[PDB]
Symmetry: C3
Subunit: 257 residues, 3 copies
Amino acid sequence: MQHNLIAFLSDVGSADEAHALCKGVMYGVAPAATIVDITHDVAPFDVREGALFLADVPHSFPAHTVICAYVYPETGTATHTIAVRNEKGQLLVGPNNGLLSFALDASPAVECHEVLSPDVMNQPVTPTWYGKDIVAACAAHLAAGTDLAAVGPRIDPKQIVRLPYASASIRGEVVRIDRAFGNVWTNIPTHLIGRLEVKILSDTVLELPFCKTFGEVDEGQPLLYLNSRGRLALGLNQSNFIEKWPVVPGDSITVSP
Amino acid sequence: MQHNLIAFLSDVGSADEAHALCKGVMYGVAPAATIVDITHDVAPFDVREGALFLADVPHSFPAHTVICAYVYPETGTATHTIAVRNEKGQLLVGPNNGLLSFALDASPAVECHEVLSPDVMNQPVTPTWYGKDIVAACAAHLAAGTDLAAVGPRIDPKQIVRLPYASASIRGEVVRIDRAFGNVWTNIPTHLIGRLEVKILSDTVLELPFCKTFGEVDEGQPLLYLNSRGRLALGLNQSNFIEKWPVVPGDSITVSP
Amino acid sequence: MQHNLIAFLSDVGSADEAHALCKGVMYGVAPAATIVDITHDVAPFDVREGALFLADVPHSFPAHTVICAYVYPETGTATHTIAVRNEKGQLLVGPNNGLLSFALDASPAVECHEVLSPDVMNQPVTPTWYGKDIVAACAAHLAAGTDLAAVGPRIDPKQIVRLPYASASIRGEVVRIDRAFGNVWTNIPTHLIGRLEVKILSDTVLELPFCKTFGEVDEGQPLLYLNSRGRLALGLNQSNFIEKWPVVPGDSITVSP
Ligand SMILES: Nc1ncnc2c1ncn2[C@@H]1O[C@H](CO)[C@@H](O)[C@H]1O
Ligand SMILES: Nc1ncnc2c1ncn2[C@@H]1O[C@H](CO)[C@@H](O)[C@H]1O
Ligand SMILES: Nc1ncnc2c1ncn2[C@@H]1O[C@H](CO)[C@@H](O)[C@H]1O
């Protein structure tokens, strides 16, 4: 089934031609397709960061999307590329190394195949650039309407490598930092908490108001809020939270009355 | 009226998925549309910088463009999003916080509405991301051909918040720095000045040649020139001016014989 | 001949609107065209870096591509813009300052013209922005199907300025660094070498395994490999090579048994 929108993520950066050569390959295979970057600024080899960036992609993108993603330090080894159709009807192509984990949490795999057929690859395949020659190439063939079954053998969904994700029990942790603004996102869902005391940084205790948005406190002041989808977040109104309280992903966050 | 080209600016950066999720929403609503970034590297919350970046957009882009822009620290408050048709026939969508000021100077507002209708929003609207759920969503509905009147109530052009812009009287000031090259742009127009003495930095006095272009002086040497549209500028031939004379926006520049 | 794909490179960065204004001009002229960035992060004025980034573009992109590239410190002087049809049938537009050198090595010029006709320029042409008003504008006219002969007078291929490129004789040198990962690329071709001793950094001698890919050594360990097209490269498995051995382009690399 034609999937005319390719959404593209990698760790190769956008500061040289690498990411663009992949687009060249994709436009060659699927001249009817639109290519849009998710980002190419995933930290090098950081599969978990890439996985986090993909989490909300299935929901925000239409059904005719191919999610093409690679953070692939295992390029040229036995770790295969996989192609997946999800419950929304979107297609996903990436290394079977955990990268697609959180995107699949959002919309589960319905059918999954290993990408082994030379006919969906850019030949000759260079061992160090499976990202271009297998992931990007296959994504474009699928965008063009190639049968998922033609990419290679079917595998069971459990054969898709998944990254563990910690759940809040209220004790949670920092999942990621929105580096543009310095806002801190936790794994604490809306329902578990429904001024509060927040414990982090030599047992830092902050008394923070729970707000709907940034502007409900004065400029530079800290706030708690529920972020763009259902998770507790910390920020400063028009300032950078991690410049005041330098927390990293994995650090514990406890919220109590 | 269909406006098949969406030009997109924000302060969310291009180093994670945020800006891409907005594009996902827009492609979902307007599958016939082309989306092109202006930039997402506006300094966080810096409405004036965003406004400056938009100034030359109306002239450079065709009439069938929707200018979709958000630098929106007031997200989730009483400061509304507005939708505008300009004199060129382009559409603009952004927060009513001054962001569109200089784009509107270039091509004035003809009709303006507040974006209040849920039917042009991405539901449910998250208080902290009006950028995606109102600005981007509405821009896409307009691109798809939604009547401007359908977005919400008409307002008078004077209800559009405008950022003050200093005029040269020759005494002017630094407006912006082209950070890629370090060239300094002033507010001094072509007609007011038509070697010269330039006073800035402990009363720095420079004797500079007025040139048409960079290569009219030797490499590394300073020059005065009229920039890409009618304003006096300072640069070094194949070097970075603000690395030699570290001026910031707002600093006074006086030019005399 | 219509060339519906414009691949776009410059040194103006993607952190402000400059690169986007060029796209505005191009979309205005060629509304049927798709514009994809190669990169805008070429170091300022660095023609050689830009040239290197373009080298693999002809091969990776389809025949209906216009390669639009400018790193143009000679803007507004006697150094003209040129338009070229290559052996693949692609079109290229850029300053005649060496920028297109390595792209032309990959697919030689068949026909070349100087861009002198006002009718393929964005009028009025600003002396400091030939990149937008001549290079981008002309690229779009060619994309739209303008006869190459209409841009200006024919020149001989030898009138295209070329950058010298050092050949390996095994003694070679560092050509470029993949800054995303810190991998080092040399000019040493596959055939000249077909554990090895590598001499660089106070006569640094390393004993390195020759591998097909990164994962064939333990994490953090150095390796030799043949890169994404036929040249000897140095890297660390999931680490940054130039953070351990800080080599720059031009530095000698000797490989021996
Ligand atoms: N030095 C390296 N070590 C391990 N993987 C690398 C290295 N350089 C690039 N890669 C990987 O190559 C992949 C592309 O095939 C990238 O996604 C990247 O993770
Ligand atoms: N910590 C913050 N304080 C104020 N505004 C913010 C913050 N983080 C993000 N935003 C704003 O949210 C907007 C998107 O709705 C962005 O344009 C940005 O300016
Ligand atoms: N200060 C400068 N000196 C020389 N060239 C410049 C300068 N600033 C911008 N340019 C050149 O202008 C070109 C666009 O016409 C860019 O490719 C850039 O190389």
